[PDB]
Subunit: 225 residues, 3 copies
């Protein structure tokens, strides 16, 4: 029901030690990247946030991060979910430390929030109060700066992004144009921690507004047609 | 059943007034684009045709129009459908007018047509007698020229495009290479209005032929 | 159940006898490509292998070959499946010959194999002993050289590719980065037929290992 947290789930985790050179080349790894940590889950943006948290916890870089077409509910196999993440580090021990931090974050209480009775509309409005190396590079900001990580379905996201930008002293960093692979959209915005929180609150309120009344236009403006 | 119209449905409509400069930049809006009209629906090509119609009905441009991966039946949320369209114009009045025209067209009787008993094969074969400013740009043709807008599933579309091109003096302007995001295919063809209609008729007949006999070669 | 073949199915096949010049342009056909053979099926990588086999059997080229977003189980229409392939040749007879070779290969016993009890994890580990003109070009190798054609879901594929590369005397040719349209991943690897076979066996073993222990990563490395 509305305001319920949708629990995210990790599906698979593995380590590759001493990554083969042939794979290192196709993944465009750095010379010091000797080991990989692999993860899949049923929620991509929670996982991306978790991977960023991993870069604060261990000597790891996010070297691969992609979402699956049409999202987890349309996965055709058990472990595909809707995201694959790859951490790289100098040793299996560092990768292992990174993956443990990732897993712990995914199960920390974060998640998309439901906007209606059957959870058929949901959104992410996460204040990342201290970015790691992954999301700061994605956003083009300095490490440790704050972000509003805003995700919703396509029309809700566009409407609510406008609301969020107007509500808060925040800057556009990265636009997720609709559709991304999972048919969502949104943005990374930056500013002070209080401004990012204000943007998150406004984004959430705007998504809920659309969910509650998606076709109000018909009665107000399409009458006598 | 065969020849039934599949009714297209609008799922959500919203307007943005005084669009934020940050969003204007990311959408690559023009300076006169102050207001946005947003729409989602469960049929993308009908919506694209309707958005083009709106540019003839109001002072609006189609500034964004994209389809969802794997189509409306695989939507994971209620309002995603399989298309998002954005109209831009100088005022809320003009984008409401544009949306009203879009809605009218979507409800006008246009739509995908079923080619079999359980409506599991369908196609779009729509003659656009006079393009607006959106489908003329997509096709790379002069504004106001006619189009045949032809869509079907991948193999049906390739087979039926062949038939359409042979049936009248038309040129292929834009090829929708399989898969588009919704796993369809097709093309925009141009020529005289009567040639485009002949192409539409041939396209429809060819899709029906494949539906009736999918493995016969 | 585990080790079961998942049988691939052909959904539609048609011939265009004299392709129109407008269609030839958009498909970037060459002048000698007069006839087209169209096929869809519910298994893309089996079909790609089959199309390559067709080029060995007949004077046909693979001129178009693409997978559908989210795979055959999410198809919204009857004939879309998860792949469209197009053969081009000099005549309808030659295209028909190519299509027959394609269909025969699809039904030959090749296919994805289940890695668990409800067939919810599967993989492809096919040794192409002698490539035709399609997969040799895709891989960037001489026509007639061998490939391991390795496909699995995203994490399994990455883990199992590393295993295959370490186990077998093979080289990386083409990386299918996750996700491809059907949300799979994998690679084409080349080497002797022996080495390609060893890569296939190691890939299969590694995918099965992940299926049996999907969350396990704490063991000594
Ligand atoms: Na589905
Ligand atoms: Na090796």
């Amino acid at each position: 029901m509305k305001n319920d947290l949708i629990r995210p789930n990790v599906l698979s985790v593995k380590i590759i030690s001493n990554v083969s050179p042939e794979m290192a080349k196709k993944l465009e790894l750095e010379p010091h990247h000797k080991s990989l940590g692999l993860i899949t889950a049923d929620c991509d943006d929670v996982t991306y946030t978790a991977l960023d948290e991993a870069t604060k916890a261990a000597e790891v870089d996010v070297v691969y991060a992609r979402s699956m077409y049409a999202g987890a509910g349309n996965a055709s196999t058990k472990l595909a979910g809707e995201v694959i993440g790859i951490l790289a580090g100098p040793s299996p021990a560092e990768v292992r430390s990174g993956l443990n931090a990732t897993l712990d974050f995914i199960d920390s209480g974060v998640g998309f929030v439901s906007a209606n009775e059957d959870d058929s509309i949901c959104y992410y409005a996460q204040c990342v109060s201290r970015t790691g190396s992954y999301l700061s590079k994605t956003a083009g900001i300095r490490e440790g700066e704050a972000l509003a990580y805003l995700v919703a379905p396509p029309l809700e996201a566009m409407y609510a992004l406008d609301a969020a930008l107007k509500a808060a002293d925040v800057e556009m960093c990265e636009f997720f144009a609709p559709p991304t692979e999972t048919n969502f959209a949104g943005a990374l915005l930056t500013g002070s921690q209080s401004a990012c929180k204000a943007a998150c609150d406004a984004f959430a309120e705007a998504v809920q507004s659309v969910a509650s009344n998606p076709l109000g236009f018909l009665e107000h403006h399409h009458h006598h047609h």
